[PDB]
């Protein structure tokens, strides 16, 4: 044999493998913990709301 | 031939109020909170029945 | 020579809220309330770190 063999494959044996159950695979990401809108409010004042 | 369909949930409600002195006076027809609850339940029943 | 100085305590805060139906439906990633609390705490930590 003058060509490569099994031991020359590196990335295919290193990437983790997971089982698929459909032709479309979905996943969810978290991007932010909230909007940057200022944290100081004052004495006895209800602070504003925020959303991630 | 096949198809896919979706249905959307909606919301119904009502609010009842009783003043503090009214809860302290004597009542000729039993407790008033129970009467208010019964009236609210029956009103909601009628609204649901006609909305159906 | 001597001098006297003063410092004024400041206030920080934020508000988070979740609708009632959101707590009644199935959740993909666990309890929504705990996730929102963690997000708010981390956002507050970052805001304090940058304000320092």
């Amino acid at each position: 044999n003058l060509s490569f063999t099994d031991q020359h494959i590196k990335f295919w044996k290193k990437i983790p493998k997971q089982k698929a159950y459909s032709t479309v695979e979905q996943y969810g990401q978290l991007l932010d913990y909230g909007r940057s809108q200022g944290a100081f409010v004052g004495e006895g004042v209800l602070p504003d709301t925020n959303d991630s | 031939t096949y198809a896919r369909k979706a249905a959307f949930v909606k919301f119904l409600g009502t609010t009842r109020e009783v003043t503090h002195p009214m809860t302290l006076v004597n009542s000729a027809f039993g407790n008033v909170i129970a009467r208010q609850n019964k009236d609210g339940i029956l009103w909601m029943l009628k609204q649901i029945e006609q909305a159906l | 020579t001597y001098a006297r100085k003063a410092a004024f305590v400041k206030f920080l805060g934020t508000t988070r809220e979740v609708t009632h139906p959101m707590t009644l439906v199935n959740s993909a990633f666990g309890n929504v309330i705990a996730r929102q609390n963690k997000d708010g705490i981390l956002w507050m930590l970052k805001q304090i770190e940058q304000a320092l």
Partner: peptide
């Protein structure tokens, strides 16, 4: 020819696409 042609919108599924439950990971990233 029953097949699943990479359709994402649930209201546009046709043929073999309707015989498909969603595959969603249960760990947030």
């Amino acid at each position: 020819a029953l097949e699943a042609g990479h359709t994402v919108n649930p209201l546009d599924l046709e043929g073999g696409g309707a015989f498909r439950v969603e595959s969603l990971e249960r760990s947030l990233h």
